[PDB]
Design a binder for this molecule. Structure first.
Ligand code: FMN
Ligand code: FMN
Ligand code: FMN
Ligand code: FMN
Ligand code: ZN
Lengths: 370, 368, 367, 353
């Protein structure tokens, strides 16, 4: 019986930059829930590495490129989207706002991109569907120890309009998240979307014990099985080593999702962006690549595409915007990324999004302190 | 309502970095942060500064050097040191004597004044500060072809001997200080009023840049050259292929610059880009370098890395804020003296000596 | 000297926080004796930042569940790839002294390393051990007969390997201790003997000064010959000293810079490990120490050529905080911390850890 | 000018602490003239962080006991491989000025470098030196007669070598001195101050002093290997690697980073002195392993002199010898020659690691 008082205000916000939104959202979100969202593993040195990796590869300004009115629109697996970013799957939007995942979904569908719905969302998929208003959605799952539980949840996703499946596999056990331990934080909501399918070790499960209850012993046959049952495109999420990309494709994955889980999993690992080129090279344009874990600016969207990604996923900045203004606050953030990217396209000489994929990047061996 | 400083006096310059905080005391908040500020969290502005520690000067002994000669020459103009004034908008934000005051200091010193299209002063006000001194005109292009012809023709009539095409501001950088301060201009821009719906007064740079031409292409470099019949510099080059592009479209000079980190964010420090560009230029045309020059050591490093002159921006505008034409003059004199000390200590008798200096590579970076 | 005496299990969210916590319970002189290092402690900071030079890869669909941290060094089967480092005078941290540490170590299921400069007798220690494995760390006497006596008493006590620490012929420049004028507040039974009196009221400079300075390879061969025990050479940072130690009949290489308490303006210990491993060529086992604070550091060490790592400061901050139970909590933490890292990197057993790809970070700490 | 006057032994745990200690006792302008450097002092910091680029290895079972720090330079037998750097106006630090430093150096047992610009006469310095060995540092004057006048004067005082400091034909940009409007509170008996000296120093000037003084000549301020090669060919008998304690050219390398390239070029043709940022025994070791034969000490000796006069400067020289002895034991060096053969660990990460 835990009291949780999330903000409920709905409103547009001014976004000068997304970094300032973290301090701003701290003032309106309960301490434990805010720090669950903002924190990462150990020292949080790898979360800083996710941010600072963007300074390793620098953009060139380009002059007399015959560019005017850049077009940020793109296409992924047949989905026409307004900008080359989507919403990453996160199950804890209820910590940021009372409208939970329905608030984000509405912002994302109004904006005109893809909403990734974690199966373990605190919002009911009737609250969420109203938010989406017909909009494209993907479903994120953990592998469960029970095969029937897996079939049922996959069926549930398809029945809920899902057009791809995201299997997050970098999470077989939890990362060592010092804020959450120190704050003795307990996630207060349930999982309405999948509660009726929970079997065995997943019985009575929440986000509090989800890592241990789910499947540790994931292998490539799991990727194949999931793909076979659903028949929807499968993204394998959490990839940081290029060998795992080879494996995922050989296993029948329809996309590669480069991520370190916002640095909330393995500690003393590289910043996610540093891992991307090796992965893109191994993929060799075989399947679409989504990249996340550290995206905060339009320069970062540009850098990632230039480095081999097709689209990027946004996380924390959108949740901070949702805390600050509900669906409209989240929308303000997506609007921000869109306008930010179109300036960067103009100044780097990119007419459209495919042009971004071919930018020259300046190598900065000096790193952050320069 | 905009209360710019108006005192004219020489200033003591120990270094140029100190002038920033000094100007912040006398310049109104809005205008001051417009001058001082850069894009994003200003990391590339800091990279502009720190890029200077990446290549270090060697002191050289028994070099047979005395009373170094800082004088040089670029496109026919004999100048007293290898720097010119950078084209900078709206000097009225720093001092009431505006562009006419900077023009006076630059001309008394004996280098070239660059005139920004976004000047708050008319060609005639600037020209009476210059008193016959050399000037280049920096154009922010209108969309309309005849307006460009008219702006170029006024510039040339007034006595401009080069044109500078600034092509790195087709849209504005993300300059957070200005967004947060809600910065608008307190006065108009005579040279470009013709394509602004309004004067410029009460307008944002976003919308003034938005009024200028976005779809610049190599044709614009060819056409400006052919119309004006003057050397054309292409300004804002950070990528070597743009330098080759420019020269091939008919440019007579390359101006390496990142707009003092006021444009594209998360891009390199301007000085780190210089050798690759100078390599591609391969001595076909002269190179101006700018963005982060603060010391004589910086002038020397810039020349040793392939530049022919550097342009000075923020320090001279801080000088103007603090002392009008005499203040700006104080800054120019500082640079000349600072370079003079560096030339003696590095074993360089003239500017040409500076272009051949060895540099120590520093792979450690700023923290060493 | 009022060392704490409370015995309780500890929560370890991370080992770094233990240092500040132990600060409030351990007397000033002794705390800083434990915490401090040479010079301005730059090399101690190097020990810690070296871990960011090589970074771990998360791995997926690895077919891994319940990872197994157990391994075997020499004869001994141990529950995780780490051991207790030899550390003097545990009485500075807790009244239960070395007996407290010995209990936590044997209950956990690893090897206790006994310092020659302990404040507890072989008898006090054997009692906390309850038949648990032990290695004896010698700081040599100048007198040969005394070295034989010491070695005999240790082997008689149950030691199954000898560790010759050779990186302390002379004390390091430990500014904290100089400024605090630190002297031991109790005696050292084992080396008494060659101290011309007691170790009580003596400084470490002079206790080290009493020990042998002219250690040569002959000492390694003589220790081994007399012992009939596996001999470790501790304090190696240069690959040439590993050739040397093996040539002289060493059965193990212990890679260490003494927790940065000795040669100042030297590298972080982790950065020296690969060249040493390269040179040793698995001829003898490698113990690595100096800066281990996380399970990630255990996995990186092993992945870089170590066979086990030795834990020091954190166990002693644990002991200060909770006696044998606090110390146990630290050991339990490292084991649980490594099991997590093993799951996330896709390692089923300790041998997999040794085969991990690492990611090169040329940028260093600030990235 | 109120300089400190107390004489006393100091205990030094490190030389770094002396700067803040001396600052409480030395007049503000004089103190900042000593402690300060060119520009925002980034190259002073580089002089200090340079030592972190090459790291010492501990070595074990090296059969070493009681290391010997004594060595020999140009026939001079000294108690440790360091000497006193020539420094102006010791009277800024202490009322006993250059005599006090002289006595500390003499009694410890090494070579005193006498600056042309000292506030003490040769006779005052000779009194402190008490027979102890001395070298004379010259800023060349424009007038040839004036140069050989001071050279003969140095010789007759018993100078056994000449230091040609050539890295200072004009002053560095010392912001502390300009901002403090610092002026010397006394004169220079022996000889705006930099401008009166020779600016147009050429190789000839080296070959002239070499050939005419009858003394061995060090050329001081070298940071580029080509100036070492020039100086040897011009008749120099020693190369002195220095950036003048970062008081001259700004935005130049840390002195220690320049050493290996110069030593490789000199190629043991003549002795090498090294200075600019030596603060620990670890530093003396590293400089010797990087190709120096001796190092010269500057600011830490002056802070010692400020804190306890001749005896305070002695405590600093005593510290360095004790520091090096510890380093020698731990690196496996029985003697100074061994130090020169030490391997160094390359640290590409620099200071922040
Ligand atoms: C509070 C929080 C909760 C998360 N929960 C999940 C989740 O339930 N499922 C999933 O696949 N990823 C989860 N992620 C990882 C995100 O999908 C994504 O990789 C991450 O937010 C990107 O990092 P960034 O937000 O700092 O840019 C979570 C991330 C955060 C910050
Ligand atoms: C206040 C200010 C206004 C500027 N206005 C213009 C302009 O109107 N036209 C132009 O070509 N560059 C403009 N610039 C860029 C400068 O020409 C030059 O590239 C830059 O000042 C050099 O960087 P620095 O001053 O930091 O050394 C401006 C720079 C500043 C600081
Ligand atoms: C308080 C303390 C005492 C030490 N005493 C000894 C000792 O008696 N014998 C020895 O071989 N090493 C001694 N060491 C060094 C350790 O064996 C080991 O190399 C070091 O603690 C590992 O560094 P870390 O604790 O920072 O990880 C001592 C270390 C500490 C912290
Ligand atoms: C206060 C002061 C005055 C100096 N005066 C001279 C001088 O007169 N002649 C000279 O050759 N070098 C002079 N030097 C430089 C020293 O010879 C030497 O290169 C420097 O002190 C070494 O750097 P460090 O003391 O920081 O280690 C001076 C240095 C200092 C600190
Ligand atoms: Zn002659």
């Amino acid at each position: 019986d835990i009291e949780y008082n999330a903000p409920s205000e709905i409103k547009y916000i001014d976004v000068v930059n997304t970094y300032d939104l973290e301090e701003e959202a701290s003032k309106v979100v309960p301490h434990g829930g805010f720090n669950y969202i903002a924190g990462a593993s150990g020292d949080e040195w790898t979360k800083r590495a996710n941010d600072r990796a963007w300074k390793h590869k620098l953009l060139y300004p380009r002059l007399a490129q015959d560019v005017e009115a850049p077009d940020t629109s793109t296409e992924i697996l047949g989905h026409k989207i307004k900008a080359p970013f989507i919403m990453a799957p996160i199950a804890a939007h209820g910590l940021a706002h009372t409208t939970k995942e329905a608030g984000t979904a509405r912002a994302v569908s109004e904006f005109g991109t893809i909403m990734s719905i974690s199966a373990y969302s605190g919002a009911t998929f009737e609250e969420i569907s109203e938010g989406l208003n017909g909009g494209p959605r993907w479903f994120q799952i953990y592998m469960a120890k029970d095969d029937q539980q897996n079939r049922d949840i996959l069926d549930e996703a398809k029945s809920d309009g899902a057009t791809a499946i995201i299997l997050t596999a970098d999470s077989t056990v939890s990362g060592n998240r010092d804020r959450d331990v120190k704050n003795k934080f307990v996630y207060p909501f349930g999982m309405p979307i999948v509660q009726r399918y929970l079997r065995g070790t997943a019985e009575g499960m929440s986000l509090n014990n989800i890592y241990g209850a789910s499947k540790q012993k994931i292998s490539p046959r799991d990727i194949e099985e999931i793909a076979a049952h659903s028949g929807l495109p499968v993204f394998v999420k959490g990839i940081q080593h290029p060998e795992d990309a080879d494996m995922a494709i050989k296993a029948g994955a329809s996309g590669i999702w480069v991520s370190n889980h916002g640095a909330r999993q393995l500690y003393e690992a590289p910043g996610s962006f540093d891992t991307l080129p090796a992965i893109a090279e191994r993929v060799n344009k075989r399947v679409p690549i989504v990249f996340d874990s550290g995206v905060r600016r339009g320069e970062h969207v540009a850098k990632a595409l230039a480095s081999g990604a097709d689209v990027v996923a946004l996380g924390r900045p959108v949740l901070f915007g949702l805390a600050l203004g509900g669906w409209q606050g989240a929308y303000s953030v997506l609007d921000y990324f869109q306008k930010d990217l179109t300036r960067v396209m103009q100044l780097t000489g990119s007419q459209n999004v495919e042009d971004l994929k071919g930018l020259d990047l300046f190598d900065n061996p000096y790193g952050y302190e320069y």
